[PDB]
UniProtKB/Swiss-Prot annotation, chain B:
This is Small ribosomal subunit protein uS5. Its main location: cytoplasm. Citrullinated by PADI4 in the Arg/Gly-rich region. It comes from Homo sapiens. There is a cross-link at K217 (Glycyl lysine isopeptide (Lys-Gly) (interchain with G-Cter in ubiquitin)). The keyword Lyase does not apply. One of its GO terms (cellular component) is focal adhesion. Residues 44-107 form the S5 DRBM domain. One of its GO terms (molecular function) is cadherin binding. One of its GO terms (biological process) is translation. The modification Phosphothreonine is found at T194, T212.
Curated annotation (Swiss-Prot), chain C:
It comes from Homo sapiens (Human). Keywords: Acetylation, Cytoplasm, Isopeptide bond, Nucleus, Phosphoprotein, Ribonucleoprotein, Ribosomal protein, RNA-binding, rRNA-binding, Ubl conjugation. Residues 107-180 form the S4 RNA-binding domain. This is Small ribosomal subunit protein uS4. Pfam families: Ribosomal_S4, S4. NCBIfam families: PRK04051.1, uS4_arch. Belongs to the universal ribosomal protein uS4 family. There is a cross-link at K92, K138 (Glycyl lysine isopeptide (Lys-Gly) (interchain with G-Cter in SUMO2)). PANTHER family: 30S 40S RIBOSOMAL PROTEIN (PTHR11831), SMALL RIBOSOMAL SUBUNIT PROTEIN US4 (PTHR11831:SF46). Coiled coil: none annotated. Residues 161-180 are annotated as: Disordered.
UniProtKB/Swiss-Prot annotation, chain D:
Belongs to the eukaryotic ribosomal protein eS21 family. It is found in: Cytoplasm, Cytosol; Cytoplasm; Rough endoplasmic reticulum. InterPro entries: Ribosomal_eS21, Ribosomal_eS21_CS, Ribosomal_eS21_sf. Component of the small ribosomal subunit. The ribosome is a large ribonucleoprotein complex responsible for the synthesis of proteins in the cell. One of its GO terms (molecular function) is RNA binding. The keyword Transmembrane helix does not apply. This is Small ribosomal subunit protein eS21. It comes from Homo sapiens (Human). One of its GO terms (cellular component) is small ribosomal subunit.
UniProtKB/Swiss-Prot annotation, chain E:
Belongs to the protein kinase superfamily. RIO-type Ser/Thr kinase family. Interacts with CASP10. Interacts with IRF3; RIOK3 probably mediates the interaction of TBK1 with IRF3. Associated with 40S pre-ribosomal particles. The chain holds residues 105 to 208 of 519 of the full protein. The gene is RIOK3. Involved in regulation of type I interferon (IFN)-dependent immune response which plays a critical role in the innate immune response against DNA and RNA viruses. May act as an adapter protein essential for the recruitment of TBK1 to IRF3. Phosphorylates IFIH1 on 'Ser-828' interfering with IFIH1 filament assembly on long dsRNA and resulting in attenuated IFIH1-signaling. Can inhibit CASP10 isoform 7-mediated activation of the NF-kappaB signaling pathway. May play a role in the biogenesis of the 40S ribosomal subunit. Involved in the processing of 21S pre-rRNA to the mature 18S rRNA. Residues 20-30 have a biased composition (Acidic residues). It comes from the Eukaryota. This is Serine/threonine-protein kinase RIO3. Autophosphorylated (in vitro). It is found in: Cytoplasm. Widely expressed. The modification Phosphoserine is found at S8, S21, S23, S24. The modification Phosphotyrosine is found at Y18. Residues 17-55 are annotated as: Disordered.
Length: 141, 218, 180, 82, 104
RNA sequence: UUAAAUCCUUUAACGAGGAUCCAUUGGAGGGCAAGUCUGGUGCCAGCAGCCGCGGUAAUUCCAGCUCCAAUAGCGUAUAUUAAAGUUGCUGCAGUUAAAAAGCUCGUAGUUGGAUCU
């Protein structure tokens, strides 16, 4: 069992330190290779330039063609497939426009129906998609 | 109309047994729901903890019947927990109450600190261990209420426990086994021994004994 | 550096369980019974009572002969009595644990002006408090969360400048009387 | 069980097993209570009075009830020495 | 109680001149009247302030008894393969923790 | 008021019918309070944090109506904390679910029979 002496503190804490790495969450947060491989670079939102639009096929049970947009991040030049959130919102987005992109909400997991997309477009040309969808804004170019 | 089959039910039918506590002193089996219905009256409040459905796999196919976990409780008194399977739901519920009154147990109410007034909490931290579910009941000071999951919260409102701490272990998501575990703990209140009950007991007669002359006539 | 104070306290706690019918029922019943604007007034009163009870409970773990046990015990008793909740016969530290939420909402200026009947209805009472027509002693109070003391309860008036008070009739009356 | 004022704040006092002083529970339905008779020491006549033994369910289950009754009857002298 | 081969206690019956006494012949008719529980409540429009009444007898919005009866009535509009029982004849206060599981 | 202004506090006059001097943000399968309401699309568009809905009556889309929650605030993403007794000193596990080295010796380490008022 567990060592239960009174002069055994360094063994207990060294054992704890070595066994904290096998926790994948603590290793992901503290070893920090997922922090460098993150396209956002530990950022809540990123800003890119639209490169093309791709219709990606969904999972096998739910058949749909989700209209993702391939953008190039201004920061480090990584290619991002970001899902345009709502229906009819693919119409507003246009090639070579400055775009603000956020994740879906599983902290780095392809959420649900779409393999390879864990990002969603929030803003285009410094106006939101929610304003354009609800008839609140006029899009500049 | 209430019809007696036990001799205990015959004694309860007349005014020979004053309260429910002559049964519990002697651990006599309460085999009729309507004994419990007689002694407590309308004080027994209850709400169904869950109706979980199990589809019975049969020779013809799959046809479902429903299992009712109901919790009946006399406040600052007694609790019972009933589990009943039936074709309907309301039939399963009524079977669950009539089965839960058979499972009425008295819980012990004690004190945390100094002993002033009516008892309020579990007298000593007990445990209920049912099918990988482990419910610990810890005494608590006045007015803190019961800190627990909703279903043991229900059973501890019904127990008359005003305030206690609760710890759970295992798969809690099985509601029925969780409720059976905490029910086992509040039964283990009298299954536990305290230094208060260290005096040598004096043995009274079992209700069958001094009242057998009336059972000769029946 | 600046000559400023950044001491600020959140005076309410959001409940952990967001949608349960029991909590929503008790909160809405209490709101309707003493006429509050939203749930945050209930949550504020709940948090104040929780702090008082937790202080009392953290006092009870000390010895009976502990000096600060006695000192802040007497202080807590005196404050809870002068605010108008406890009574002089109930000066014991364990009786604060026998307090509930509405015992703190009965001392609001809204409920006090309703119970003393100087206004008509409890929503009318809240309106009359915020509409600047009701004063305490000599100071005009326009805030319905004003927790009225026991000794200051016995004199609440109509704020003499008000039309319900001494005089100076309002805008609507002076417009109506200058019609013809 | 009893507050500082002195009132017996308890629902009832449960009986204890005579063999091992354990509290016999409410739903311990395997427990027993012997009434055992003693005799007049001159003629072997029933007196009408009786001694009492209570045994919990576990003692009866493991097979130790009869030896417990025998040794408590030796203690009470209802069964003779040796 | 229900057996075909049955016993008759006729010889132990002592006296029965007038068997059809008017004590067991009570005419129980409550269907077409307004005393049957199996009748709609004629629902009131939803209050905006969220409660009915004032003082101590303020009947609130959900009001667990009322909400339980409402959830029972919402069970009454389930799938035909579902079996309910007699949930209106016996006062069934069923909660959302249970009703939502049954609805699922 | 103030260095002089501002803002707050005080005073005169004007200033109030909701069809306003008009309150938003999310949601209504479960988790989780709220609809088996109506019309359209028809595994398309989409919703969807999880399970899943949509393949011609959609309890989940799109609109409208109604309802709920919080309310001058309310969603969203990220990071982190509690729930986590899923890092375990308190306090986890190791036959079969992840797991005890093939076995033995052995240094450092860790712990070490009674016994003296």
């Amino acid at each position: 069992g567990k060592c239960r002496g009174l002069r055994t503190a360094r063994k207990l804490r060294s054992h704890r330190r070595d066994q904290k790495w096998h926790d994948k969450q603590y290793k992901k947060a503290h070893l920090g290779t997922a922090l460098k491989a993150n396209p956002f670079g530990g950022a809540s939102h990123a800003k890119g330039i639209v490169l093309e639009k791709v219709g990606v096929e969904a999972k096998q049970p739910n058949s749909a063609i989700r209209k993702c947009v391939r953008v190039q991040l201004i920061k480090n030049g990584k290619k991002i497939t970001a899902f345009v959130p709502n229906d009819g919102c693919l119409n507003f987005i246009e090639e070579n426009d400055e775009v603000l992109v956020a994740g879906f909400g599983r902290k780095g997991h392809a959420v649900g129906d779409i393999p390879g997309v864990r990002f969603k477009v929030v803003k285009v040309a410094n106006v939101s998609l929610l304003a354009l969808y609800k008839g609140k804004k006029e899009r500049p170019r | 109309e209430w019809m007696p089959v036990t001799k205990l039910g015959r004694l309860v039918k007349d005014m020979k047994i004053k309260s429910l506590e002559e049964i519990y002193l002697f651990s006599l089996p309460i085999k009729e729901s309507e004994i419990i219905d007689f002694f407590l009256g309308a004080s027994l409040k209850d709400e169904v903890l869950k109706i979980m459905p199990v589809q019975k796999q049969t020779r013809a196919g799959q046809r479902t019947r429903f299992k009712a976990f109901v919790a009946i409780g006399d406040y600052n008194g007694h609790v019972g927990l009933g589990v009943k399977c039936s074709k309907e739901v309301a039939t399963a519920i009524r079977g669950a109450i009539i089965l839960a009154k058979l499972s009425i147990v008295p819980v012990r109410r004690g004190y945390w600190g100094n002993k002033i007034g009516k008892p309020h909490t579990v007298p000593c931290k007990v445990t209920g261990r049912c099918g990988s579910v482990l419910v610990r009941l810890i005494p608590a000071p006045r007015g803190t209420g019961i800190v627990s999951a909703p279903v043991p919260k229900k059973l501890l409102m019904m127990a008359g426990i005003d305030d206690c701490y609760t710890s759970a272990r295992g798969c809690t998501a099985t509601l029925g086994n969780f409720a059976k575990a905490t029910f086992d703990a509040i039964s283990k209140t009298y299954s536990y021994l305290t230094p208060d009950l260290w005096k040598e007991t004096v043995f009274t007669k079992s209700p069958y004994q001094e009242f057998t002359d009336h059972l000769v006539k029946t | 550096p600046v000559a400023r104070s950044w001491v600020c306290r959140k005076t309410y706690v959001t409940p952990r369980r967001p949608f349960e019918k029991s909590r929503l029922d008790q909160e809405l019943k209490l709101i309707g019974e003493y006429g509050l604007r939203n749930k945050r007034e209930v949550w504020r009163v709940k948090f104040t009572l929780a702090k008082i009870r937790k202080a009392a409970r953290e006092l009870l773990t000390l010895d009976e002969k502990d000096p600060r046990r006695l000192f802040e015990g007497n202080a807590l008793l005196r404050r809870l009595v002068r605010i108008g909740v406890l009574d002089e016969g109930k000066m014991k530290l364990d009786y604060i644990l026998g307090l509930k939420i509405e015992d703190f909402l009965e001392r609001r200026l809204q409920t006090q002006v309703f119970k003393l009947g100087l206004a008509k209805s409890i929503h009318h009472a809240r309106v009359l408090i915020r509409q600047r027509h009701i004063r305490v002693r000599k100071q005009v109070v326009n805030i319905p969360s004003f927790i009225v003391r026991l000794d200051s309860q016995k004199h609440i008036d109509f704020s003499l400048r008000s039309p319900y008070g001494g005089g100076r009739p309002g805008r609507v009356k002076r417009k109506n009387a200058k019609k013809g | 069980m009893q507050n500082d004022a002195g009132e017996f704040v308890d629902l009832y006092v449960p009986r204890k097993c005579s063999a091992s002083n354990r509290i016999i529970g409410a739903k311990d339905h395997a427990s027993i209570q012997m009434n055992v008779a003693e005799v007049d020491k001159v003629t072997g006549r029933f007196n009408g009075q009786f001694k009492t033994y209570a045994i919990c369910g576990a003692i009866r289950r493991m097979g130790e009830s009869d030896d417990s009754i025998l040794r408590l009857a030796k203690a009470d002298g209802i069964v003779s020495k040796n | 109680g229900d057996s075909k081969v049955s016993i008759s206690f006729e010889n132990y019956r002592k006296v029965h001149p007038y068997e059809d006494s008017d004590s067991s012949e009570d005419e129980v008719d409550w269907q077409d009247t307004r005393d049957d529980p199996y009748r709609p409540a004629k629902p009131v429009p939803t209050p905006k302030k969220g409660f009915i009444g004032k003082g101590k007898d303020i009947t609130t919005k959900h009001d667990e008894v009322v909400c339980g009866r409402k959830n029972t009535a919402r069970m009454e509009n389930f799938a035909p393969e579902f079996q309910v029982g007699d949930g209106i004849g016996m006062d069934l206060k069923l909660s959302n923790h249970v009703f939502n599981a049954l609805k699922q």
